[model samples]
Target: EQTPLQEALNQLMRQLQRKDPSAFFSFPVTDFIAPGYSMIIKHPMDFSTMKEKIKNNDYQSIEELKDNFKLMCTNAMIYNKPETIYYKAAKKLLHSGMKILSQERIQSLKQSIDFMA
Candidate 1:
């Protein structure tokens, strides 16, 4: 049901999603839960959306998926105050997710070489 890239994306996505234990970034930020959310954040994204995209094979490159993760975090940062939990969670998630992505990138590159060679 998935290609090699999709499988790798799932692995990476779940790793990043686990960083948010509170499930804050797990799903879409609804206007019900977050008032004025739709009015403020022009681009809304989340872990669930990313997962769906991967499942649908919508992401053509790793960079595209990375961009969506960045957007998800930055949207929270923009919508919530710095003193708020949402903002802080977004910051923390972003930092940790980036670290995971960086480390995975090296391993992925090596695997790519292995498969090709």
Candidate 2:
């Protein structure tokens, strides 16, 4: 029922979801949870959206999925301040996810995200 591309995307999706232990990035950031979320984040994304997109075969390549992942993390970083736990978690998830995506298998990277600049 699924294509090879869809299969691979789902596999990668599961891997990334595992890193999100707290489920903070599991769903969309609603206005009720955080005010002005829509005003701040122009392109919002989340695990549930990604899952739906994958099932609908919207992601044509790994890069598309990667873009969405980056956008999701980026949105969190932009909304939450550097001193907040949300920002810290986003940075960690972003780096961890990128590292895994860059390699053929799951792995870690030495590079860090620079939000100070």
Candidate 3:
């Protein structure tokens, strides 16, 4: 049986998978593939390449990453698109998940044009 924390994390993962179907945080198998496990199994990307792309504002890589992540998540399940209210709730749930996983005291903030800055 899973511990309470594990079960709670699974629930949060499912909720995130529903909310931001296109977001990296919503990647399917994230719960099964724990951070530690993934780190051990997957090779790390070249940070120099990634940082250079980010610095150059070359968003093609980011967009492709998002597309691939979404494809993986959707392939793992057959869920229909959630309602708008559920999407909002899922976003909040994911933010909470991030806080828990990061052990950081942060809250979701409103997004604006400045968010892209």
Candidate 4:
């Protein structure tokens, strides 16, 4: 059974499709994929490089690292499409993974350790 939120989103999509089929069709939905973890793992080196730079105290690299991480998390969440229990479970798992990664980064900071830990 579709959740009310999913129904609403579908309705909105339909409305948009009716209004402008081409635009609606072009809407990005690649993020809504099952087993998205494979994609997550494929680019592990990208994250490792960022982590290495951060550990080296290269503060200037933080902005791009943060933006990339944000985009990845957003893509993970968006692709999971939390609707059913299973889908929600997957989304929550991805969310938790991101949270843990974020917490690790936060804990790495001297100023953040006392406040965040």
Candidate 5:
């Protein structure tokens, strides 16, 4: 039988697979094929801890919550190769979670600038 934490992690894995799937935290079978595992192995931070840490900021202000997620994301990226899609996908998944924390359920944030002014 799977534990509640394992179930939640599986849910997130499914959510990411249909979205911007990466194996950074997707667990054993998926992680086995996850290219990001190469970069992630350098630091080897536990996935469970990240969820717990991320949970601590639940209901916190938007900026603070985002910052916490970003902090964990970047910390693990110290040796993460920038040239791989896995790196980008993992980064996107983490940042993407920040916006959905709001009720509007926004998925992404893109840059916009006016040039014709």
Candidate 6:
């Protein structure tokens, strides 16, 4: 019983020694975008890298935030074709400036965290 479960877990995180997951890129928010929204990824990899920071709770610098701002917005458009959730959360984050989300908006932050959950 335990052996089977352990094997499955190991297979899933085979890169555990040190490596990122697959390239299943998507915005890390459920802020819900406009029906016909748009996006434009200036630096494509920024989206991927930014999500890494988000998933790891490593957000710390303005430069990093700025790079992600571009990535997240581009993804918003990519996801616009995409879905109802462009970077609805991060869009506001960037617009307001690179600061951690406010106290009242914790729910929104929770949803983004759940994206990795």
TM-score: model 4 vs. ground truth: 0.28
Candidate 4 lDDT over 1-117, as tens digits, reads: 543333332333233234322231222233344455556534322233434444554434233444544454355444445675434543443355354436444345434334433
Number of the predicted model whose TM-score against the real structure is largest: 1
Could you tell me the lDDT of residue 87 within candidate 4?
A: 45
Taken over the whole model, the C-alpha lDDT of each candidate is 0.88, 0.85, 0.36, 0.40, 0.45, 0.40
Query: For model 5, which pairs clash?
Result: none
Question: Would you list the rank order by lDDT, best first?
Answer: 1, 2, 5, 4, 6, 3
- Candidate 3 stretches with Cα past 4 Å from truth are 23-117
lDDT of 3 at 49: 34
Report the C-alpha displacement of residue 52, candidate 3, in angstroms: 29
* Residues 1-117 of candidate 2: C-alpha lDDT, one tens digit per residue: 887667777888999999999999999999899999999999999999999999998987677899999999999999999999999999999999997688654222111112211
**Candidate 2 regions off by >4 Å?**
103-117
Give residue 65's error in model 5 in angstroms: 4.6
Which residue ranges in model 1 land beyond 4 Å of their true spot? 103-117
- TM-score of every prediction relative to native: 0.90, 0.87, 0.23, 0.28, 0.39, 0.26
Best by lDDT: 1
| Residue lDDT tens for model 5, 1-117 | 544333343444344344444445533313456456555554443344445544553322334434544554564455457777656766776666654443342221111111211
Q: At residue 88, give the lDDT of candidate 1.
A: 98
Could you tell which candidate, 3 or 6, scores higher by TM-score? 6
**Shift in Å, residue 99, candidate 2:** 1.3
Better of 1 and 4 by lDDT: 1
Model 5's alpha-carbon lDDT is 0.45
Predicted candidate 6, C-alpha RMSD: 13.9
Candidate 2 has an lDDT of: 0.85
Candidate 6 colliding pairs: 33-84, 38-77, 39-77, 79-82, 79-83
Number of the candidate with higher TM-score, 3 or 4: 4
